[PDB]
Amino acid sequence: DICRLCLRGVSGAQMCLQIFDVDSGESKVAEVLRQHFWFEVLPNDEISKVICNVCWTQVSEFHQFYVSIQEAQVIYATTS
Amino acid sequence: DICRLCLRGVSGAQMCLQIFDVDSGESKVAEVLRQHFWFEVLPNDEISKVICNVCWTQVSEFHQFYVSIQEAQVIYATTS
Numbered sequence: 001d002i003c004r005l006c007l008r009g010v011s012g013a014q015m016c017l018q019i020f021d022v023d024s025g026e027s028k029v030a031e032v033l034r035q036h037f038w039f040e041v042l043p044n045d046e047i048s049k050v051i052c053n054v055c056w057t058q059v060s061e062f063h064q065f066y067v068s069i070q071e072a073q074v075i076y077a078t079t080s
Numbered sequence: 081d082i083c084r085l086c087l088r089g090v091s092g093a094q095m096c097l098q099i100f101d102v103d104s105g106e107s108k109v110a111e112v113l114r115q116h117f118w119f120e121v122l123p124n125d126e127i128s129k130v131i132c133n134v135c136w137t138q139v140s141e142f143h144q145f146y147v148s149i150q151e152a153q154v155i156y157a158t159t160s
């Protein structure tokens with residue numbers, strides 16, 4: 001198996017989150033990845049439907065930051 | 081002054097990078113911010129043309145990661 005993002009070797013699977021899990025559609029992980037990358041994340045994929053914790057930590061940390069920035073910008077734009 | 085991203089109080093300016101600097105246009109900082117956020121970063125801005133190191137560390141760390149991911153995806157998509 002391979003990490004969908006970094007495409008590096010997956011050791012087993014307990015370094016990894018499943019992007020999708022069986023009778024999939026709707027993931028949260030997929031939704032976050034779609035927000036920050038230019039390619040698509042879909043149930044099928046010849047590539048992979050797993051992401052290593054190393055990539056997920058970087059994406060989720062950035063997303064948490066990104067969400068804080070959106071909130072500050074929203075408040076500023078809606079205040080006199 | 082205020083951080084263009086988090087809109088929090090700028091202490092002085094040595095916690096901050098100038099997004100733009102005098103006879104501006106072309107920044108690298110602006111270019112990276114434009115890649116990861118939904119609003120525009122421009123010389124004028126009623127808002128601010130400075131970014132605190134706290135925000136810049138988060139953006140630049142993510143961007144470095146993002147660049148590594150693009151490279152892996154490019155190689156995969158161009159290899160048999």
Ligand SMILES: [Zn+2]
Nearest residue numbers: 003006052055
């Ligand atoms: Zn990875």
Ligand SMILES: [Zn+2]
Nearest residue numbers: 083086132135
């Ligand atoms: Zn900031």
